[PDB]
Amino acid sequence: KKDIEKLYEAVPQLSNVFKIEDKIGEGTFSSVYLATAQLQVGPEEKIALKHLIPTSHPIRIAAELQCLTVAGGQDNVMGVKYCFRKNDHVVIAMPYLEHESFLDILNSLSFQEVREYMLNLFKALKRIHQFGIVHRDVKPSNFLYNRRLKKYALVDFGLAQGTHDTKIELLKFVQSEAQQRAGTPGFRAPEVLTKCPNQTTAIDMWSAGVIFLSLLSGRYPFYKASDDLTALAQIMTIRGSRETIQAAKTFGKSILCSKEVPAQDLRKLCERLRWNEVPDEAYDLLDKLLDLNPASRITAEEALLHPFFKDM
Amino acid sequence: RLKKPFVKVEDMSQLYRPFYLQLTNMPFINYSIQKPCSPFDGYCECCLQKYEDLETHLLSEQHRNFAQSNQYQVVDDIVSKLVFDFVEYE
Ligand SMILES: Nc1ncnc2c1ncn2[C@@H]1O[C@H](COP(=O)(O)OP(=O)(O)O)[C@@H](O)[C@H]1O
Ligand SMILES: [Mg+2]
Ligand SMILES: [Zn+2]
């Protein structure tokens, strides 16, 4: 509640536009509020006010805004209504998308809903990747899902980086994570966990695989790890230590591991963990998303063409 | 040398320092634990300085100087590209 009052004080113009009701999010880089506003066009609208931590560099703030402005508003990528600023206080206003907690719906999604969820995640990923945005933090709390409405939004570009040929100009000026801004270890691809200097849009595809893994196994969070190498150890136990070491060689990292652990069959893993008739195509797609080699890992565009998604 | 179990990662081209993981036990896939449990169950970018209290760092003169400068023009350039369609009250 004092948060609400202090948000109003740091950005006075918010007083004139929004009735700020609740705080619906907090992270190390931002707090998010639910608010009501009146549209000139007629109706009232529920709005998400994302308050960026005043320690963020202008470039970082501008970059996220630019991703929302340029890539967002389409294909399940969140867009931006407006942005408010007083000094180092920057508040991004977005349409509020009411959404389920991932845990709460996890064990209750029908299999068809699991296909739609994934299909919609890949539409968003396809969108952002065509602009050369590497999200770097794809995970259920950044992919908003309204079950009732069948509505989906990829949010949170606070960690994003640009590909070499990115269409988002400001992302060129964002210090690389491997060069210098860290996600949840358990959604991070082996080439991120091992600090590979070359990190492409493929790292986002890995994260979608981790989400898909949760969906198929009914376990969330699947990889529960407080640091990168624990998540890497856990990945090795799923995908095999030998297989992980081999793949890491291909991107300039040399992994030594104490206990050799065998790769797991994905179907048997998920089934034992967890609808009566999950097709082979699901585990085949999962295998491609969790491809340890980032060069061969499936892309968002190829994922939408995958037999798992016939006919949708 | 290293006590087991361990994981060791190094860059093949010396670009990074080696880094390590050691735990009591390696991850074990636990199928017995109930769903949805896991089977495996500051610094200011503006002032380029580590701080101890966010609020007090924010209220420092070096942060105040950066906050009230032309540095946010990059943000204002984008904002000027957006249509304001809310009703504003006095
Ligand atoms: N447009 C939105 N509509 C509804 N809820 C949102 C929206 N944007 C953010 N949120 C909520 O606030 C949380 C935090 O926002 P996010 O952009 O991920 O920033 P951070 O992760 O830095 O806190 C989200 O996980 C989501 O639950
Ligand atoms: Mg987030
Ligand atoms: Zn500062």
In terms of C-beta distances under 8 Å and separation of at least 24 residues, what long-range contacts does B50-55 make, across chains too? B51/A55, B54/A53, B54/A55
**Amino acid found at B59:** L
Q: Which residue, among B39, B10, B86, B4, has the nearest Cα to A47 in the 3D structure?
A: B86
**Residue of A22, A137, A228, A287 marked active site:** A137
Q: With contacts defined as CB-CB under 8 Å, which chain A residues touch B89?
A: 16-17
CB contact under 8 A, B7 and A69: no
- Count the residues in chain A: 312
The encoded tokens of residue B73 equal 């023009």
Experimental method: X-ray
- The gap between the terminal CA atoms of chain A, to the nearest Å, is 45
Backbone angles phi, psi at A261, to 5 degrees: -125, 140
Q: Which CATH class is domain B5-23?
A: mainly beta
CA A227 vs. chain centroid, Å, equals 18
Q: Which residue, among A207, A201, A294, has the nearest Cα to A249 in the 3D structure?
A: A294
| Cα angle, residue B48 at apex, residues B47 and B49 outer, rounded to 5° | 90
Residues of chain A with CATH 3.30.200.20: 1-97
Q: Does the domain formed by A1-97 have CATH 3.30.200.20? A: yes
Contact between A160 and A67 under an 8 Å Cβ cutoff? The reply is: yes
Please give the CATH superfamily to which domain A98-166+181-271+277-312 belongs.
Transferase(Phosphotransferase) domain 1 (1.10.510.10)
Annotated binding residues of A for ATP: 24-32, 50
The encoded tokens of residue A299 equal 């892309």
Q: Which of the four CATH numbers 3.20.20.150, 2.60.40.1180, 3.30.460.80, 6.10.250.3410 does domain B42-82 have?
A: 6.10.250.3410
Please name every residue paired with A89 in a beta bridge, in sequence order, or none if there are none: A86
Pocket of ligand 1 (CB under 6 A): A 24-27, 29-30, 32, 48, 50, 78, 94-97, 141-142, 144, 155-156, 158
Contact between A36 and A47 under an 8 Å Cβ cutoff? The reply is: yes
> Looking at ligand 1, which atom is closest to the CA of residue A31?
23
Interrupted after residues, chain A (C–N over 2.5 Å): 180, 274
| Best residue for ligand 1 mutational test, from A50, A77, A98, A142 (most atoms within 8 Å of Cβ) | A50
Question: Which element (helix H / strand E) includes A50?
Answer: strand A44-52
User: Is A131 in a helix, a strand, or coil?
Assistant: coil
Distance B56 CA to ligand 3 centre (A): 10
Of B11, B75, B84, the CB nearest to A61: B75
Q: Which residue, among A226, A150, A120, has the nearest Cα to A182 in the 3D structure?
A: A226
Exposure class string for B75-85: b at 16+ Cβ within 10 A, else e = beebbeeeeee
Farthest-apart Cα atoms in chain A, separation: 65
Which ligand has the minimum distance to the alpha carbon of residue A26?
1
The encoded tokens of residue A295 equal 């060069």
Q: How far apart are CA A161 and CA B54, in angstroms?
A: 26
Q: Is A137 a catalytic residue?
A: yes
User: Is A184 in a helix, a strand, or coil?
Assistant: coil
Q: Is B46 annotated as a binding residue?
A: no
